[PDB]
Amino acid sequence: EIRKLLQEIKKQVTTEIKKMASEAGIDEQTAEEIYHLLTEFYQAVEEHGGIEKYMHSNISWLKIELELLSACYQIAILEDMKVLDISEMLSLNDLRIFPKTPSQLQNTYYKLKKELIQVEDIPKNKTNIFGKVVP
Amino acid sequence: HYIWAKLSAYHIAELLEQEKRYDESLAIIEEARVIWPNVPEFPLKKANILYVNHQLEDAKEIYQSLLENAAIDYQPIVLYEATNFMPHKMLGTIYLEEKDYTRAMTHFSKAYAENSSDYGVMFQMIMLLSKFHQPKEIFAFMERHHFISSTETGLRLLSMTTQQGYAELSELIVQSLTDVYPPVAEATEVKIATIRNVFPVISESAILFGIKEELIDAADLCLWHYENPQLPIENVMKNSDVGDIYDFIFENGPRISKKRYLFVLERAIALGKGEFADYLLALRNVYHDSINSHIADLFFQYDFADIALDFYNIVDADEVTKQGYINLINYLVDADVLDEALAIAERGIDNFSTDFRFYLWAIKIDTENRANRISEAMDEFPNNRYLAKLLDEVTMLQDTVTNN
């Protein structure tokens, strides 16, 4: 139900989207927030060059990308959807909403929820083995 | 949906894997798994690349999926054993490494049923039977399952058992062979007798044939010459393009490659030739002080851990090898020294940042930070499913008790 909705949102990236969520029992505002966050991210992906270019840049995550991830998990979790299912669904293996793997989505959601990272741009970054002294 | 493309992509995936460009190779596979999901040769390669890269649980998942998958109707395109023999052979190899001897025998047996001529599974089953059973019982097994299909097959088996030190099994094997050329039999009898610490007497022709038939190598000749100086080993060794090994070990000659020195030492350790091995160890001074790290690994490999420890204790940590870390981590964990073990596992992550085993050791050891240790591993291995399954276990249990 929610998985089918998120697909149609990604396709656009206006009025029609709110109607799709309401039919499937999804809050129009929360759906509206996702559409703005996705379009801002996809525009932001082009603001950093190309999708392939962004993936090879030293920037691992975007604040807008991180905003969109936490937004997507929240709305999907309210539908009794498992974390791993959301990870695969939003990843490259399914809806290709994020240029990330399921392991990457679930790990970063874990990092966000356990406050291991803030919602900012994230970059990609005579002695023994025992320690005693060998005479 | 054309077979030339599927095979073209495979030539590429295989070419990259052979050049050890595994990440590029796995990229080709994952692309193939999307376009041609029925071709099992692609998943079978992911499993093999994952195996050598020490992600055994992810490899197990794929091999298990290759046998009897309900979701995909795997139809091979060139390797028709991709869904039969090869998954069994690898699952048996992994389960052996995992010390699940019962599961290893089950798959090894099945793999042998599929292809009965693979010296790989036979060598492994024979060694696995050595864990429990006696040589006469093992030979009964091999005869029962028709291991020795021909004389050449038995000799190829014999080169394996003689190097492992299986004196009685080798004796059973060679005696069951029919009409063996006498030089071949003499070389085998001498090799079996050397395992038994019997004075070695071998004819010049038997040595010469034994080298050519790849039943005798330079280590064998050096051991024999050390045990019996009356043997004509120098003339044979000089002509065999290994004269330097003879000169170094016996004639105070110049240094040989570290690989060759350790070759002779390994055979000595493997055959239980303690007198010869000590003598060889006396020659290590001419090598760099780093040579002791390799000797340490050698001793650890053959389960002389106390002797291996004594070498590791005197090696600069900069020169301790990646296997050495893995040996040391395993040793300390068995000695209930988790603090020092974790320190080495952590060290492995810093030096060998791409080796899956070190991150896994930290996860196993650092129980207090397990969830964090798992997350760190995923950062380095973003396509590994085992890590993702591990985090969900901890994450679901925490999130259920905390939220309710």
Numbering used by the authors:
A (entry chain B): 5 to 17, 25 to 136, 152 to 161
B (entry chain A): 233 to 636
Sentences from the paper on this structure:
Listeria monocytogenes GmaR is a thermosensor protein that coordinates flagellar expression by binding the master transcriptional repressor of flagellar genes (MogR) in a temperature-responsive manner. In L. monocytogenes, flagellar expression is transcriptionally coordinated in a temperature-dependent manner by the motility gene repressor MogR and the antirepressor GmaR. GmaR forms an intermolecular complex with MogR and prevents MogR from binding to operator DNA, resulting in the derepression of flagellar transcription. GmaR is a four-domain protein that consists of glycosyltransferase, TPR, linker and antirepressor domains.
To visualize the GmaR–MogR interaction that is required for derepression of flagellar expression, a GmaR–MogR complex structure was determined by X-ray crystallography using the MogRD protein and an N-terminally truncated GmaR protein (GmaR231-637) that contains residues 231–637. In the GmaR–MogR complex, one polypeptide chain of GmaR interacts with one MogR chain, consistent with the 1:1 molar ratio observed by native PAGE and gel-filtration chromatography. The asymmetric unit of the GmaR–MogR crystal contains three copies of the 1:1 complex, which exhibit similar quaternary structures. MogR-bound GmaR (GmaRMogR) adopts a duck swim ring-like circular structure consisting of three α-helical domains, similar to the GmaRApo structure, with a root-mean-square deviation value of 1.27 Å (393 Cα atoms). In the GmaR–MogR complex structure, the intermolecular interaction between GmaR and MogR occurs in two spatially separated regions, antirepressive sites 1 and 2 (buried surface areas of ∼350 and ∼540 Å2, respectively). Antirepressive sites 1 and 2 are observed in the C-terminal extension and main body of MogR, respectively. At antirepressive site 1, a small cavity in GmaR on the convex side in the middle of the antirepressor domain accommodates MogR residues 152–156 and 160 from the C-terminal coil structure. The hydrophobic side chains of the MogR I155 and F156 residues at the protrusion of the C-terminal coil structure are embedded into the hydrophobic cavity of GmaR. In the GmaR–MogR structure, GmaR residues from the α26 and α27 helices and their connecting loop make contacts with MogR main body residues at the H6 and H7 helices. In the overlaid GmaR–MogR and MogR–dsDNA structures, site 1-adjacent GmaR residues substantially clash with dsDNA atoms at the MIG site, suggesting that the site 1 interaction limits the accessibility of dsDNA to the MIG site of MogR via a spatial restraint.
